[PDB]
Amino acid sequence: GEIAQALKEIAKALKEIAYALKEIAQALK
Amino acid sequence: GEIAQALKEIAKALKEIAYALKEIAQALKG
Amino acid sequence: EIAQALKEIAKALKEIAYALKEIAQALKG
Amino acid sequence: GEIAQALKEIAKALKEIAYALKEIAQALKG
Amino acid sequence: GEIAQALKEIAKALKEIAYALKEIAQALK
């Protein structure tokens, strides 16, 4: 239902956050 | 209901955090 | 308890999103 | 100026993250 | 289960954001 849908969007968001942070780490290194 | 709504707003917040962090990465790379 | 917790976490994350947008602006710049 | 702003916003962000994490810890213990 | 999992990954994400921002502050100083 609506909880499962919410959690799918949270998973998507978190994948992009992980990627963004990898690029920030690279820049700083 | 309340849990579904809370989690939808958390998803929205996290998408804006993803965007913010992509702009920070770009800024730091020049 | 979990409904309340999740509402506070949503609020917190909206403030964090705003803070990070201002940090991005400063760093651009 | 830009460096002062960056540092002020980083301090704010870190305080909100500390609070967020306290709520997550409590939720998971609940 | 799925809400607990989501919250664990959000906690991880936020710890990495905190670390990234501390390194940015240090760089700027």
Of D5, D16, D30, Cβ closest to residue C16 = D16
Measured CA to CA, the distance from residue A7 to residue A10 in angstroms comes to 5
Cα–Cα distance measured from residue C10 to residue C15, given in angstroms and rounded to the nearest whole number: 9
Distance from CA of D19 to the nearest CA of E (A): 11
Resolution in A: 1.3
Chain-centre distance of CA B17, in angstroms? 3
DSSP state of E29: -
- Distance (Å, rounded) from C-alpha A9 to C-alpha D11? 29
**Closest among A14, A1, B18 to E7, alpha carbons compared:** A14
Burial (Cβ within 10 Å: 0-12, 13-18, ≥19) of residue A19: middle
Instruction: Check if the beta carbon of residue E12 is closer than 8 Å to that of residue A13.
Output: no
The minimal CB distance from B21 to the residues A7, A9, A17 is found for A17
CA distance A29 to chain B (A): 11
Cβ contact, residue pair E24, C20, below 8 Å = no
Return the axis-axis angle of helices E2-28 and C2-27, rounded to nearest 10°: 30
Question: HSE-up of E8 (CA within 13 Å, CB side)?
Answer: 7
Closest Cα to residue C1, out of B8, E7, A5?
E7
